[PDB]
Amino acid sequence: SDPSSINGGIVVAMTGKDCVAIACDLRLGSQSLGVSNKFEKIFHYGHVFLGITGLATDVTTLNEMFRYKTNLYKLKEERAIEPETFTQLVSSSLYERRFGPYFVGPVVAGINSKSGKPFIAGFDLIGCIDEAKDFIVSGTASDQLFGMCESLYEPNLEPEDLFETISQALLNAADRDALSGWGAVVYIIKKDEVVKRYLKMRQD
């Protein structure tokens, strides 16, 4: 009866030296029952990455929606949408459903391909933008993620260091939440290569 914690799951994002990382768990459940171990919560539209936590049906719907909107954007503008811009489009789209919202906690990460700047942001279900230098967190284990990140994080990490840090924040937060976990994926994003790593984690 609280739509934001029927299915469970989490997303975290971090900035480093000329890179960003964004990670999620793989659980999809119906309350106590784990149902799927392969439910990824991160999507990309060109070089802009979007993670979505919350009600899975809305997660799926919103991915389908932003694919649609960015495809048309590309056709009309003749370029890939940038993270600063995509962030604004996410905000508009959620607030448009102000009094009947999507029960989601989206997170945007990527590198602006003109300015080279790393960029992350997070949103509430009705579109409020939270831009941050350091990290954004989302999902049923968000308290834990806030704790892990605020203590583990330091500015200007190299991509392979940032990888360890974001992975340890995710894993240890997931393990203190009954509704998150069951696998995990980490995206390391540099100006033009993106590595995707699946983490080994406890399956309970």
Partner: peptide, 4 residues
């Protein structure tokens, strides 16, 4: 939703 975040308040101020």
């Amino acid at each position: 939703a975040x308040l101020x």
